[PDB]
Design a protein around this nucleic acid. Structure first.
Ligand code: CL
Ligand code: K
Length: 332
DNA sequence: CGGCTTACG
DNA sequence: CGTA
DNA sequence: GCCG
């Protein structure tokens, strides 16, 4: 089993959910305590289990797997022997973990913000609503719409959303296209947000497109929160909150809109499709194993000072020496 | 031992 | 810092 | 926490 998540297919459905979820609890807790290295190892170990074809039943099966060492093997060992791991259970029942998970699940709140609020004695969402001076406008929106934003987004919502996004994009720029990315492109049936990638076949036509799209959406009354203020002034990404029509009502939905020039489209498609761990492992592999710098704009050779002109995601995998993984196999 | 994705708002 |  |  190879060491990078971008070297192995990881499907939606896998066989070690109980073991994976426990390691991901420890990964989350490591992040809450500011140990980004420990988070990564626990996430990578959990990902290794997701790629296995069969359930792990004996400790010997962990031999030869990357990212498994004394600590992660002890966690699996306890789960195999007793069905629970005492370290994991102590974490999930701890007030620190429950409060940090509660606060970091708010749109606009990360680990450092949640940790500050925790040290100040805050424990519940109502504690936050009673301290509005501690909140950015972004966090006020995440708190105001928290119940809706914690409701899982379904495929039915995605199709309705893509319709209204395509309408606004079409009114903003003839011939522009809209591509669903993110978890739903990977085959997930639920999500916490919906990601769309927007481009135009003619390079340059997409300049200034996202503000025109956001204005069309605001005019349809569809935007509840938007981070940029528009009638640097230009922007190409918007992580907004939509007022999605429902039968006789509406529901707030997190939506990401990204504009990219068509020359960068395969890199943008690869980037925004995820998963998050897949992307980190792919970019790490690119830099550390191939000496190339990858992001959502391109693939840069710092020695030749040139960008690789890709026409497809397959082109990028091939240039990196990787077997192609379709999006449904990028669920690391 | 040091590294751990890499951008934009 | 937050977003992905 | 684990790898290079
Ligand atoms: Cl990027
Ligand atoms: K958050």
């Amino acid at each position: 089993m190879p060491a990078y998540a971008c070297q192995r297919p990881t499907p939606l459905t896998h066989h070690n959910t109980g073991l994976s979820e426990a390691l991901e609890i420890l990964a989350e807790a490591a992040g809450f305590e500011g140990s980004e290295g420990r988070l990564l190892t626990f996430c990578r170990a959990a990902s290794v289990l997701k790629a296995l074809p069969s359930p792990v039943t004996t400790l010997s099966q962990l031999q030869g797997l990357p990212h498994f060492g004394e600590h992660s093997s002890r966690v699996v060992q306890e789960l195999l022997e007793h069905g629970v791991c005492e370290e994991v259970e102590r974490v999930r029942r701890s007030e620190r973990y429950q409060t940090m998970k509660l606060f970091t699940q708010i749109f606009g709140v990360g680990v450092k913000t949640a940790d500050r609020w925790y040290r100040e004695g805050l424990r519940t969402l109502d504690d936050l609503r009673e301290q509005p001076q501690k909140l950015t406008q972004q966090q006020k929106a995440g708190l105001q719409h928290h119940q809706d934003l914690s409701t899982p987004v379904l495929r039915s919502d995605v199709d309705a959303l893509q319709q209204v996004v395509e309408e606004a994009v079409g009114q903003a720029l003839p011939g522009a296209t809209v591509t669903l990315t993110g978890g739903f492109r990977r085959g997930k049936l639920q999500g916490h947000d919906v990601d769309f990638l927007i481009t135009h076949p003619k390079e340059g036509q997409e300049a200034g497109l996202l503000p025109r799209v956001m204005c069309r959406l605001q005019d349809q009354g569809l935007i509840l929160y938007h981070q940029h203020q528009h009638s640097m002034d230009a922007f190409e990404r918007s992580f907004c909150i939509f007022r999605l029509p429902q039968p006789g009502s509406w529901k707030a939905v997190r939506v990401d809109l990204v504009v990219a020039p068509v020359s960068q489209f395969p890199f943008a498609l690869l980037g925004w499709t995820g998963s998050k761990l897949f992307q980190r492992e792919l970019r790490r592999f690119s830099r550390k194993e191939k000496g190339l710098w990858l992001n959502s704009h391109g693939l840069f050779d710092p020695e030749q000072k040139t960008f690789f002109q890709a026409a497809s995601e397959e082109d990028i995998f091939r240039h990196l020496g990787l077997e192609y993984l379709p999006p449904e196999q990028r669920n690391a």
